[PDB]
Design a binder for these strands. Structure first.
Lengths: 332, 5
DNA sequence: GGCCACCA
């Protein structure tokens, strides 16, 4: 069925499924459509023979240089996507809802790559983008290689240090021994601190940054038990920040910033406090996000490897249900 | 840019 | 990762 976004009870039932599913993702929450306010939401779901929702896909439709929209389900659908007979049924509902307006429906779920799964998807008519492509983080919209810490490997861990070898314990201890202190919250105060460090870091890298309203809509859509901004200071001086979202089975480190000059390893202190939040809440996974390669030349791998010693997770990548093949060929 | 998100 | 860097 298609979700009637003007039916509050129906939206609540949809949200309860997303928030309680082991496959839930913040980018599949209907709150992500409030963040992506320049995209159009279209959402679909399936029910089991007992009336319960068993699968859901939140799509956002974007503009292209053609007469067709781009339909994108970021880190969805919310289900076991290797259940491809069930996937086909859900995608069929999605295609009904899109009513011919999109040239493609793309979804990039956090499911492990495998050759058997890749072949199954292609056999069902999907076009996949994974090892067949790349350009690194630019080959796909979301990075396909991700540094994920499995906290279930440490059932008795009480503090962040309990997870790490001695060399890493020393790195984590360093900022706190040098006077760095971290607080956290989700008010306008922490947002302004984040945004100063975020724009400062963007200028230093000469790169574009998102407007503050992007994060203000996210603070409006997600309460402090879901969205938390961590702020590292030393002797009152702002040093670095990070934004983490707690949703489903993971806490995700999504955005960060750091000031110019000496920052006293404060980004390590942010990571430690974020991981401590995951331990305190019994969260299975802490996700530090994408890397370009398992390499010493990748500044993303080098930093994140301090906190993730296991292999990066490699996902199936982008799964494209092609609807207008002429436009698909032009744009992809 | 693209980390996406 | 090689006190050094990383620290989106």
């Amino acid at each position: 069925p298609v979700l009637n976004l003007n039916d509050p009870q129906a939206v609540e039932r949809y949200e309860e499924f997303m928030r309680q599913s082991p496959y839930g993702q913040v980018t599949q929450d209907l709150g992500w459509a409030k963040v992506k306010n320049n995209w159009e939401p279209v959402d679909v779901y399936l029910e089991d023979d007992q009336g319960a929702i068993i699968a859901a896909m939140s799509m956002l439709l974007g503009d292209t240089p053609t007469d067709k929209k781009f339909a994108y389900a970021s880190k969805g659908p919310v289900m076991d996507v290797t259940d491809v007979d069930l996937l086909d049924r859900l995608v069929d509902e999605a295609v009904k809802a899109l009513d011919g307006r999109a040239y493609v429906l793309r979804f990039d779920p956090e499911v492990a790559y495998s050759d058997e799964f890749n072949t199954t998807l292609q056999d069902h008519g999907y076009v996949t983008r994974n090892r067949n492509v790349a350009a690194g983080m630019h080959a796909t919209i979301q990075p396909r290689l991700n540094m994920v810490l499995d906290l279930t490997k440490f059932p008795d861990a009480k503090t962040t240090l309990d997870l790490y070898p001695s060399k890493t314990k020393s790195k984590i201890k360093r900022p706190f021994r040098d006077g760095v202190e971290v607080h956290s919250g989700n008010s306008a105060t922490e947002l302004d601190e984040f945004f100063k460090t975020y724009t400062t870091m963007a200028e230093r890298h000469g790169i574009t940054h998102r407007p503050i309203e992007y994060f203000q809509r996210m603070q409006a859509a997600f309460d402090a038990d879901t969205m938390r901004i961590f702020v590292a200071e030393r002797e009152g001086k702002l040093l670095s920040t990070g934004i983490a979202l707690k949703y489903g089975r993971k806490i995700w480190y999504m955005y960060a910033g750091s000031m110019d000059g000496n920052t006293y390893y404060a980004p390590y202190a942010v990571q430690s406090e974020m991981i401590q939040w995951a331990l305190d809440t019994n969260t299975d996974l802490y996700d530090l996000g994408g890397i370009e390669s398992e390499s010493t030349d990748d500044s993303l791998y080098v930093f994140k490897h301090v906190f993730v010693k296991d292999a990066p997770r490699e996902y199936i990548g982008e799964i494209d249900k092609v609807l207008d093949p002429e436009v698909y060929a032009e744009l992809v | 840019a693209x980390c996406x998100x």
